[PDB]
């Protein structure tokens with residue numbers, strides 16, 4: 001059972017701007033997704049301060065970066081609070097309509113695309129480098145779900161049959177053909193050190209055979 005939804009108009013415009021504006025500094029997508037993962041980890045940590053059972057679904061709080069050159073995918077995994085089906089609809093737990101409006105105003109006042117994360121819609125910077133994005137997520141209060149979109153105005157949500165995650169979020173970036181530099185170990189390391197060296201969770205960069 002696959003459900004197909006239309007993006008709200010303003011989110012569709014945000015995605016079209018990210019895809020179609022000439023902007024060479026694409027590497028910021030990874031900073032934004034790691035920052036989102038840190039935010040999600042902070043949330044489950046905070047809930048666990050008063051209810052330890054919130055970590056029955058997994059005590060480890062971490063971020064994994066998994067490149068796969070055969071699949072041409074970069075996957076960012078975190079064991080944060082995850083998202084309910086309702087959160088996945090409703091723009092992956094963001095205030096994306098008002099955030100996009102504020103981001104648009106800033107761009108017209110001289111800001112650039114790299115400020116996107118200050119407006120709460122940093123997730124959509126994934127489309128700087130990905131032709132399709134798959135989000136697998138498990139929240140303590142819901143079942144495991146998969147969100148997917150190749151932009152073009154729509155996304156899908158289905159129950160995830162795949163590997164159980166326990167708790168957290170997996171962002172799978174299906175990279176554009178000309179953006180495979182983001183599968184190279186030395187490139188990922190360089191970006192993580194430049195933008196995320198002080199993240200307060202362990203970031204493990206997986207290697208390949």
Ligand SMILES: CNCc1ccc(Oc2ccccn2)cc1
Nearest residue numbers: 035038194195196197198199200
């Ligand atoms: C914005 N809150 C999350 C967060 C925390 C630490 C962090 O680390 C670095 C590393 C290099 C330069 C700047 N910040 C990056 C993001």
